[PDB]
Write a structure and sequence with these properties.
2 copies of one chain form a homodimer.
Chain A lengths: L13 H5 L14 H6 L6 H5 L5 H7 L1 E7 L2 E11 L7 H11 L7
Antiparallel strand pairs in A: 1-2
Keywords (chain A): Acetylation, ADP-ribosylation, Host cytoplasm, Phosphoprotein, Ribonucleoprotein, RNA-binding, Secreted, Transcription, Transcription regulation, Viral nucleoprotein, Virion
Family (chain A): Belongs to the betacoronavirus nucleocapsid protein family.
Main location (chain A): virion
Chain lengths: 107, 108
């Protein structure tokens, strides 16, 4: 499957699907050891997935570019998604996201 | 519905769902007049949507951050998706994406 359409699971985990976590610009930085090993089987995956954009929102919210780099042709994307501070789950969402952002620095 | 889960259509279009296209740091820049007014009702939407990430890939591929500002708490993301230059359709994919990237600069 094209990288962007892959779904990580225990049998095909985040490292297998999307590479090792890291700081480089072509690397993903999200996930602690449990999420990396479990993918969408992770016990709190639906709480993470609620922030992932629909296809319409991905192209509607993001700043999209197209670049030729020494590795080939890339569609770039950047943006920001607001957390709903009136969601009763807000504080646990903050804790959950903090547990996974740049978690690889500690393993 | 939270912004990131909206689906734009003719009845609820890209501007209404995601704001006017423009140059600013967290403003969307993608779509010509046809896509803006049609959203996923756009006749060639599937050829754009093939590049959109799954939820797992979004959090697998992207650089994710969190920012706290006077407007609230924001989940930031950056990344890149590789185009398959060996796909016979590659030239048409590039043409389609280029038609929409920064298209707003050419119309009010």
């Amino acid at each position: 499957k094209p990288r962007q359409k892959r779904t990580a699971t225990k049998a095909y985990n985040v490292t297998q699907a999307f590479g090792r976590r890291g700081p480089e610009q072509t690397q993903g930085n999200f996930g602690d050891q449990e999420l990396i090993r479990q993918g969408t089987d992770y016990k709190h995956w639906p709480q993470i997935a609620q922030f992932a954009p629909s296809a319409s929102a991905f192209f509607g919210m993001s700043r999209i570019g197209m670049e030729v780099t020494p590795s080939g042709t890339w569609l770039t994307y950047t943006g920001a998604i607001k957390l709903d501070d009136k969601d009763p789950n807000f504080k646990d969402q903050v804790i959950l996201l903090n547990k996974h952002i740049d978690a690889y620095k500690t393993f």
